[PDB]
Design a protein around this ligand. Structure first.
Ligand SMILES: CC(C)CCC[C@@H](C)[C@H]1CC[C@H]2[C@@H]3CC=C4C[C@@H](OC(=O)CCC(=O)O)CC[C@]4(C)[C@H]3CC[C@]12C
Ligand SMILES: CC(C)CCC[C@@H](C)[C@H]1CC[C@H]2[C@@H]3CC=C4C[C@@H](OC(=O)CCC(=O)O)CC[C@]4(C)[C@H]3CC[C@]12C
Lengths: 57, 57
Protein backbone atom coordinates (compact mmCIF):
# COMPACT_ATOMS: atom_id res chain seq x y z
CA UNK A 1 0.00 0.00 0.00
CA UNK A 2 2.94 2.33 0.82
CA UNK A 3 0.80 3.55 3.76
CA UNK A 4 -0.33 0.31 5.41
CA UNK A 5 2.53 -2.05 4.58
CA UNK A 6 5.00 -0.71 7.14
CA UNK A 7 2.39 -0.77 9.90
CA UNK A 8 1.37 -4.33 9.00
CA UNK A 9 5.00 -5.44 9.06
CA UNK A 10 5.46 -3.76 12.45
CA UNK A 11 3.10 -6.34 13.97
CA UNK A 12 5.85 -8.97 13.88
CA UNK A 13 7.69 -7.07 16.64
CA UNK A 14 4.85 -7.08 19.20
CA UNK A 15 4.75 -10.86 19.61
CA UNK A 16 7.08 -10.89 22.62
CA UNK A 17 4.99 -8.30 24.47
CA UNK A 18 1.78 -10.15 23.59
CA UNK A 19 3.29 -13.40 24.85
CA UNK A 20 4.33 -11.81 28.15
CA UNK A 21 0.84 -10.35 28.57
CA UNK A 22 -0.77 -13.72 27.86
CA UNK A 23 1.59 -15.54 30.24
CA UNK A 24 0.78 -13.25 33.16
CA UNK A 25 -2.94 -13.30 32.33
CA UNK A 26 -3.06 -17.10 32.15
CA UNK A 27 -1.20 -17.55 35.44
CA UNK A 28 -3.55 -15.14 37.21
CA UNK A 29 -6.64 -16.74 35.65
CA UNK A 30 -5.62 -20.23 36.74
CA UNK A 31 -4.81 -19.13 40.28
CA UNK A 32 -7.97 -17.08 40.83
CA UNK A 33 -10.30 -19.59 39.19
CA UNK A 34 -8.97 -22.56 41.13
CA UNK A 35 -9.08 -20.61 44.38
CA UNK A 36 -12.66 -19.41 43.90
CA UNK A 37 -13.98 -22.75 42.63
CA UNK A 38 -12.48 -24.60 45.58
CA UNK A 39 -13.67 -21.97 48.05
CA UNK A 40 -17.34 -21.69 47.09
CA UNK A 41 -18.24 -25.07 45.60
CA UNK A 42 -18.11 -28.76 46.47
CA UNK A 43 -16.83 -31.63 44.34
CA UNK A 44 -17.64 -31.21 40.64
CA UNK A 45 -17.86 -34.30 38.42
CA UNK A 46 -18.48 -32.51 35.09
CA UNK A 47 -15.24 -31.77 33.26
CA UNK A 48 -16.63 -29.07 30.96
CA UNK A 49 -17.84 -26.89 33.83
CA UNK A 50 -14.46 -27.08 35.57
CA UNK A 51 -12.84 -25.27 32.64
CA UNK A 52 -15.96 -23.15 32.11
CA UNK A 53 -15.70 -21.74 35.65
CA UNK A 54 -11.89 -21.83 36.07
CA UNK A 55 -10.79 -20.41 32.71
CA UNK A 56 -13.73 -18.89 30.83
CA UNK A 57 -15.17 -16.65 33.55
CA UNK B 1 13.52 -17.01 29.98
CA UNK B 2 15.79 -14.45 28.23
CA UNK B 3 12.55 -12.97 26.79
CA UNK B 4 10.31 -12.62 29.85
CA UNK B 5 12.85 -12.10 32.63
CA UNK B 6 13.66 -8.47 31.85
CA UNK B 7 9.98 -7.56 31.58
CA UNK B 8 9.19 -9.32 34.86
CA UNK B 9 12.04 -7.47 36.58
CA UNK B 10 10.76 -4.18 35.16
CA UNK B 11 7.66 -4.51 37.35
CA UNK B 12 9.67 -3.46 40.41
CA UNK B 13 9.91 0.08 38.98
CA UNK B 14 6.15 0.70 38.60
CA UNK B 15 5.39 0.50 42.32
CA UNK B 16 5.66 4.26 42.89
CA UNK B 17 3.24 5.02 40.05
CA UNK B 18 0.84 2.34 41.28
CA UNK B 19 1.00 3.77 44.80
CA UNK B 20 0.25 7.29 43.55
CA UNK B 21 -2.69 5.97 41.53
CA UNK B 22 -4.05 4.08 44.54
CA UNK B 23 -3.62 7.09 46.83
CA UNK B 24 -5.61 9.39 44.57
CA UNK B 25 -8.24 6.72 43.93
CA UNK B 26 -8.71 6.00 47.64
CA UNK B 27 -9.02 9.68 48.55
CA UNK B 28 -11.64 10.22 45.85
CA UNK B 29 -13.53 7.06 46.82
CA UNK B 30 -13.71 8.06 50.48
CA UNK B 31 -14.85 11.60 49.69
CA UNK B 32 -17.51 10.64 47.15
CA UNK B 33 -18.85 7.70 49.14
CA UNK B 34 -19.18 9.64 52.38
CA UNK B 35 -20.81 12.55 50.58
CA UNK B 36 -23.37 10.39 48.76
CA UNK B 37 -24.17 8.19 51.76
CA UNK B 38 -24.77 11.22 53.97
CA UNK B 39 -26.78 12.99 51.28
CA UNK B 40 -29.26 10.27 50.33
CA UNK B 41 -29.60 8.10 53.44
CA UNK B 42 -30.43 8.42 57.13
CA UNK B 43 -28.55 6.95 60.09
CA UNK B 44 -27.14 3.49 59.38
CA UNK B 45 -26.48 1.11 62.28
CA UNK B 46 -24.96 -1.78 60.27
CA UNK B 47 -21.18 -1.48 60.03
CA UNK B 48 -20.74 -3.78 57.03
CA UNK B 49 -23.05 -1.75 54.79
CA UNK B 50 -21.22 1.48 55.65
CA UNK B 51 -18.06 0.13 54.02
CA UNK B 52 -20.09 -1.70 51.37
CA UNK B 53 -21.65 1.58 50.18
CA UNK B 54 -18.74 3.95 50.94
CA UNK B 55 -15.81 1.92 49.59
CA UNK B 56 -17.03 -1.03 47.51
CA UNK B 57 -19.44 0.76 45.17
C1 LIG C 1 -20.89 -8.35 4.10
C2 LIG C 1 -20.21 -9.51 3.36
C3 LIG C 1 -21.20 -10.68 3.20
C4 LIG C 1 -19.68 -9.10 1.97
C5 LIG C 1 -18.34 -8.35 1.99
C6 LIG C 1 -18.42 -6.99 2.72
C7 LIG C 1 -17.58 -5.83 2.13
C8 LIG C 1 -18.03 -4.57 2.91
C9 LIG C 1 -16.06 -6.08 2.29
C10 LIG C 1 -15.61 -7.20 1.31
C11 LIG C 1 -14.22 -6.81 0.75
C12 LIG C 1 -13.82 -5.60 1.61
C13 LIG C 1 -12.71 -4.68 1.09
C14 LIG C 1 -11.42 -5.41 0.73
C15 LIG C 1 -10.38 -4.35 0.34
C16 LIG C 1 -10.42 -3.04 0.65
C17 LIG C 1 -9.42 -1.93 0.31
C18 LIG C 1 -8.82 -1.41 1.63
O1 LIG C 1 -7.80 -0.44 1.38
C19 LIG C 1 -8.10 0.68 0.54
O2 LIG C 1 -9.24 0.99 0.28
C20 LIG C 1 -6.94 1.53 -0.02
C21 LIG C 1 -5.58 0.84 0.21
C22 LIG C 1 -4.39 1.79 -0.03
O3 LIG C 1 -4.53 2.98 0.14
O4 LIG C 1 -3.32 1.35 -0.37
C23 LIG C 1 -9.94 -0.83 2.52
C24 LIG C 1 -11.07 -1.84 2.77
C25 LIG C 1 -11.62 -2.51 1.48
C26 LIG C 1 -12.56 -1.56 0.70
C27 LIG C 1 -12.34 -3.69 2.21
C28 LIG C 1 -13.53 -3.18 3.08
C29 LIG C 1 -14.89 -3.95 3.07
C30 LIG C 1 -15.15 -4.88 1.88
C31 LIG C 1 -15.70 -4.13 0.65
C1 LIG D 1 -7.04 -25.82 34.76
C2 LIG D 1 -6.21 -26.23 35.99
C3 LIG D 1 -7.09 -27.04 36.97
C4 LIG D 1 -4.96 -27.05 35.62
C5 LIG D 1 -3.77 -26.21 35.11
C6 LIG D 1 -4.07 -25.48 33.79
C7 LIG D 1 -2.91 -25.37 32.77
C8 LIG D 1 -3.56 -24.79 31.49
C9 LIG D 1 -1.77 -24.46 33.28
C10 LIG D 1 -1.00 -25.18 34.43
C11 LIG D 1 0.51 -24.86 34.26
C12 LIG D 1 0.51 -23.77 33.17
C13 LIG D 1 1.83 -23.49 32.44
C14 LIG D 1 3.00 -23.20 33.36
C15 LIG D 1 4.21 -22.84 32.49
C16 LIG D 1 4.17 -22.43 31.20
C17 LIG D 1 5.32 -22.03 30.27
C18 LIG D 1 5.15 -20.54 29.91
O1 LIG D 1 6.26 -20.07 29.12
C19 LIG D 1 6.60 -20.79 27.93
O2 LIG D 1 5.84 -21.58 27.42
C20 LIG D 1 7.97 -20.53 27.28
C21 LIG D 1 8.89 -19.71 28.20
C22 LIG D 1 10.12 -19.14 27.46
O3 LIG D 1 10.06 -18.92 26.27
O4 LIG D 1 11.14 -18.92 28.06
C23 LIG D 1 3.82 -20.32 29.18
C24 LIG D 1 2.61 -20.84 29.99
C25 LIG D 1 2.78 -22.30 30.51
C26 LIG D 1 2.54 -23.33 29.38
C27 LIG D 1 1.65 -22.22 31.58
C28 LIG D 1 0.24 -22.07 30.91
C29 LIG D 1 -0.97 -22.90 31.42
C30 LIG D 1 -0.64 -24.16 32.24
C31 LIG D 1 -0.34 -25.38 31.36
Amino acid sequence: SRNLGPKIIMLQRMMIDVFFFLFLFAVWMVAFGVARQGILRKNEHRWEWIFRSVIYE
